[PDB]
Design a protein around this ligand. Structure first.
Ligand SMILES: NC(=O)c1ccc[n+]([C@@H]2O[C@H](COP(=O)([O-])OP(=O)(O)OC[C@H]3O[C@@H](n4cnc5c(N)ncnc54)[C@H](OP(=O)(O)O)[C@@H]3O)[C@@H](O)[C@H]2O)c1
Length: 485
């Protein structure tokens, strides 16, 4: 009752056209905001062995884990296969191999050889993801090769060669107190979707976080592996671990007169819906960016925005290209003096199951949300931003079959929020995990499309809260609660 009067007051106040107000009322009780909540535990140890007596396959950059794992498995009577990085694929005898973890052909060779040797792994350990995150092309490329791409090659090869009728895959990465791993942490979103595509692959992800004065030793790693074998995501410190899940949030934003705002994907569906929304709040300057050249439709959009009081430019740029993004921020500074806010809506979708994806398709989908996001932060480092808002997707958290790289890319933005925090970036940093909008199967679930007004208001609410990651889910609260258990 109070809520309806609330909205009435707003249309009375003219924040909303009577029609918009009605659309919002019709959405009442359907739009809920969620945040990650953690549960913390003492790390207690476990038995050492897998629960079945079947071959274990371990991928590692080098042999730093070989001895400890042989010691850990003393008494376990099934093969241990240990694969390290090399120039070439090589069977190095007695369960040891080298390979190039980026070459699909090498995963084929591995599968072929193991099949010839009558070795059918069930427990797979992927532990290549180490090294600090840095916001450089070279560093990001190496991290993606150690994580997303290596895993893509591995799962595709495994399915194509039918190596594992069932597999339990444990993906590990290193982190440390005071540091962040946006790329490696995003793998969880990929693995959840592999599992939805192939339910015989049970996929787990574990962060190995060293603390100051409490390093993760080789033995503590072994112990985490054994613990996992005997129990998607857990973050492990040496003495404690924690898990997370979305839960409903507990119980006033505006752009500024003369503020300068960049909307990437600014001519796309959500990008433009937000540009009009922002133009109605105040007399602003808007820069809409997409890769495509100007067209009659981009002109029409700019005109509609200038009719609302804004000044508006369309500036073509591929924001996944570091120098283009840099040139873009420079042009905005030179043209308007400064930048006060970024809404990062650039993105694309190219759905396909992992078995049908290509590396090139993955590169395309991730470019704007992995590299683009980083380049926008990097180019705008010195700008007095009031806000840096990433349009992420609920697929990062609840993915569907076919969206593995998309889910990863969005999950990468979600983790990138911690980088901005770590670096002390000014203003509000927020990633919003949006569901499907009705603007620009689910039936059975108890979910509904998010209407334009409901979504605008969720943004408005999100911006006034303190969480740096919020998920927006549209539907019935109890149905959603089941889906999130
Ligand atoms: N609509 C939904 O239901 C929904 C749900 C969840 C999340 N989201 C997220 O919200 C954002 C917008 O969704 P949408 O429905 O508006 O899709 P959309 O209409 O395709 O808009 C995305 C825009 O991104 C631009 N873009 C792609 N790559 C780019 C690059 N490298 N540099 C600059 N611009 C680039 C595209 O234009 P060019 O081709 O000209 O570059 C396109 O206009 C996306 O990031 C999406 O993942 C949407």
């Amino acid at each position: 009752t109070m809520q309806i009067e609330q909205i009435v007051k707003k249309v009375k106040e003219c924040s909303l056209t009577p029609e918009e107000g009605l659309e919002l009322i019709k959405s009442l009780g359907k739009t809920h905001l969620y945040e990650m909540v953690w549960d913390r535990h003492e790390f207690k140890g476990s038995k050492k062995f897998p629960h079945t007596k079947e071959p274990i396959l371990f991928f590692c950059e080098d042999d730093s884990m070989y001895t400890v794992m042989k010691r850990q498995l003393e008494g376990y009577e099934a093969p241990f296969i240990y694969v390290t990085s090399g120039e070439r694929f090589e069977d190095c005898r007695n369960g040891r191999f080298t390979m190039n973890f980026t070459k699909g052909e090498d995963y084929d060779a591995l599968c072929g050889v193991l099949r010839s040797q009558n070795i059918r792994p069930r427990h797979i350990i992927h532990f290549l993801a180490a090294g600090l995150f840095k916001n450089t092309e070279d560093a990001m490329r190496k991290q993606l090769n150690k994580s997303l791409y290596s895993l893509f090659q591995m799962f595709q090869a495994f399915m194509a060669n039918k190596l594992c009728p069932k597999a339990e895959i444990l993906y590990l990465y290193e982190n440390a107190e005071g540091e962040v791993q946006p790329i490696y942490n995003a793998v969880e979103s990929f693995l959840k979707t592999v599992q939805a595509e192939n339910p015989n692959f049970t996929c787990k992800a574990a962060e190995l976080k060293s603390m100051f004065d409490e390093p993760f030793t080789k033995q503590h790693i072994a112990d985490v592996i054994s613990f996992e074998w005997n129990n998607c995501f857990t973050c492990y410190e040496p003495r404690h671990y924690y898990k997370r899940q979305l839960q409903r949030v507990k119980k006033s934003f505006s752009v500024k007169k003369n503020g300068v705002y960049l909307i990437t994907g600014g001519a796309g569906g959500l990008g433009y819906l937000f540009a009009e929304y922002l133009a109605k709040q105040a007399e602003v300057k808007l820069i809409l960016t997409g890769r495509s050249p100007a067209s009659r439709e981009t002109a029409q959009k700019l005109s509609a925005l200038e009719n609302l009081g804004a000044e508006a430019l369309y500036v073509p740029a591929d924001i996944s290209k570091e120098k283009e993004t840099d040139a873009l921020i420079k042009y905005i500074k030179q043209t308007f003096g400064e930048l006060n806010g970024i809404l990062h809506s650039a993105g694309l979708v190219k759905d396909a199951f992992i078995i049908k994806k290509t590396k090139e398709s993955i590169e395309e989908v991730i470019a704007p949300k992995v590299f683009g996001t980083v380049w926008l932060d990097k180019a705008a480092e010195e700008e007095p931003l009031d806000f840096f808002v990433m349009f992420s997707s609920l697929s990062a958290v609840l993915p569907n079959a076919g969206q593995s790289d998309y889910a990863f890319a969005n999950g990468c933005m979600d983790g990138f929020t911690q980088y901005r925090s770590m670096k002390g970036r000014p203003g509000k940093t927020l990633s919003i995990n949006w569901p499907l909008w009705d603007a620009g199967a689910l039936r059975h679930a108890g979910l509904e499309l998010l209407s334009a007004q409901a979504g605008l208001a969720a943004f408005q609410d999100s911006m006034s809260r303190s969480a740096s990651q919020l998920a927006v889910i549209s539907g019935d609260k109890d149905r959603i609660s089941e889906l999130l258990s």
